[PDB]
Amino acid sequence: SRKESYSIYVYKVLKQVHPDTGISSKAMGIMNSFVNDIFERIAGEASRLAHYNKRSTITSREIQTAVRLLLPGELAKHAVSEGTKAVTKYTS
Amino acid sequence: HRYRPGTVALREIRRYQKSTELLIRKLPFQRLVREIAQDFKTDLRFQSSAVMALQEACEAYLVGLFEDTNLCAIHAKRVTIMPKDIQLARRIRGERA
Amino acid sequence: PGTVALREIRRYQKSTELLIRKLPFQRLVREIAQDFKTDLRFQSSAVMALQEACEAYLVGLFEDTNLCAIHAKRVTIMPKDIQLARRIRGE
Amino acid sequence: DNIQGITKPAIRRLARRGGVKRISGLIYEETRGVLKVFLENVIRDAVTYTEHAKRKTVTAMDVVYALKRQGRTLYGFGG
Amino acid sequence: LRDNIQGITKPAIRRLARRGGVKRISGLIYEETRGVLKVFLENVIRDAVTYTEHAKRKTVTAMDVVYALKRQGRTLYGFGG
DNA sequence: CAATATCCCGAGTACATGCACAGGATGTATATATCTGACACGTGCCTGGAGACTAGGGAGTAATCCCCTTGGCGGTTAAAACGCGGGGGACAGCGCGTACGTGCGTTTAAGCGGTGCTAGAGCTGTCTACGACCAATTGAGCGGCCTCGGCA
Cβ pair C61, E15 in contact under 8 A: no
**Calpha distance A62→A72 (Å, rounded):** 18
SS3 C79: helix
The whole-angstrom distance between residue E51's C-alpha and the CA centroid of its chain comes to 17
Cβ pair C51, E28 in contact under 8 A: no
Among B28, B63, B37, E51, smallest CA distance to C40 is for E51
Q: How was this structure determined?
A: cryo-EM
> Hey, of E2, E6, E10, E23, which one would you mutate to test binding to chain C, going by the most C CBs within 10 A of its CB?
E23
**Calpha distance E7→B38 (Å, rounded):** 59
Cβ pair D72, B53 in contact under 8 A: no
Q: Between E10-20 and E29-54, two packed helices, what is the crossing angle to 10 degrees?
A: 90
Cβ pair E22, E34 in contact under 8 A: no
B75 in contact with nucleic chain F (CB within 7 A): no
Fill in the amino acid letter for D33. Answer: G
- Domain of E71 in residue numbering reads as 1-79
**Calpha distance C46→B24 (Å, rounded):** 52
E24 in contact with nucleic chain F (CB within 7 A): yes
**Calpha distance A17→D11 (Å, rounded):** 52
Cβ pair D13, B23 in contact under 8 A: yes
The whole-angstrom distance between residue C27's C-alpha and the CA centroid of its chain comes to 17
Residues 56-85 of B with CB under 8 A from D: 56-67, 69-70, 73, 79-83
D32 in contact with nucleic chain F (CB within 7 A): no
CA angle D19, D20, D24 (to 5 degrees): 160
Q: Does the beta-carbon distance from A69 to D48 stay under 8 Å?
A: yes
Fill in the amino acid letter for B6. Answer: G
The whole-angstrom distance between residue B60's C-alpha and the CA centroid of its chain comes to 7
D5 touches chain B (CB under 8 A): yes
**Calpha distance A21→B41 (Å, rounded):** 44
Cβ pair A63, A42 in contact under 8 A: yes
Region B13-96: CATH code: 1.10.20.10
Three-state DSSP string of chain D? CHHHHCCHHHHHHHHHHHCCCEECCCHHHHHHHHHHHHHHHHHHHHHHHHHHCCCCEECHHHHHHHHHHCCCCCCCCCC
Question: Which CATH number do you get for residue D64?
Answer: 1.10.20.10
Q: Is A11 exposed, middle or buried (0-12, 13-18, 19+ CB in 10 A)?
A: middle
**Calpha distance E70→E65 (Å, rounded):** 8
Give alpha helix (H) positions in E1-81.
Answer: 10-20, 29-54, 62-70
CATH architecture of C9-91: Orthogonal Bundle (1.10)
Q: Where are the domains of chain C?
A: 9-91
CA angle A44, D79, B65 (to 5 degrees): 90
Give alpha helix (H) positions in chain C.
Answer: 4-12, 22-34, 44-71, 79-89
Q: Which of B68, B77, B88 sits opposite C67 (nearest CB)?
A: B88
Pairing of strands D22-23, B80-81: parallel
Among B31, B93, B33, smallest CA distance to B58 is for B33
Query: Looking at CA atoms only, how far is residue E78 from chain A in angstroms?
Result: 5
Indicate the resolution in Å.
3.4
D25 touches chain B (CB under 8 A): no
C17 touches chain E (CB under 8 A): no
The whole-angstrom distance between residue A83's C-alpha and the CA centroid of its chain comes to 9
Cβ pair D50, A49 in contact under 8 A: no
- First-to-last C-alpha distance (Å) of chain C: 38
User: How many C-beta atoms lie closer than 10 Å to residue D68's C-beta?
Assistant: 15
Q: Does the beta-carbon distance from D31 to B6 stay under 8 Å?
A: no
Helix (H), strand (E) at residue B45: strand B45-46
Fill in the amino acid letter for E21. Answer: G
**Calpha distance B54→C5 (Å, rounded):** 50
Q: Which of C31, C53, C76 sits opposite E4 (nearest CB)?
A: C31
D52 touches chain A (CB under 8 A): yes
DSSP string, E64-76: HHHHHHHTTT---
Among A72, E28, C83, E14, smallest CA distance to B92 is for C83
Fill in the amino acid letter for C50. Answer: L
Cβ pair B50, D58 in contact under 8 A: yes
Instruction: Report the greatest alpha carbon distance in chain B.
Output: 56
E54 in contact with nucleic chain F (CB within 7 A): no
Cβ pair A58, A70 in contact under 8 A: no
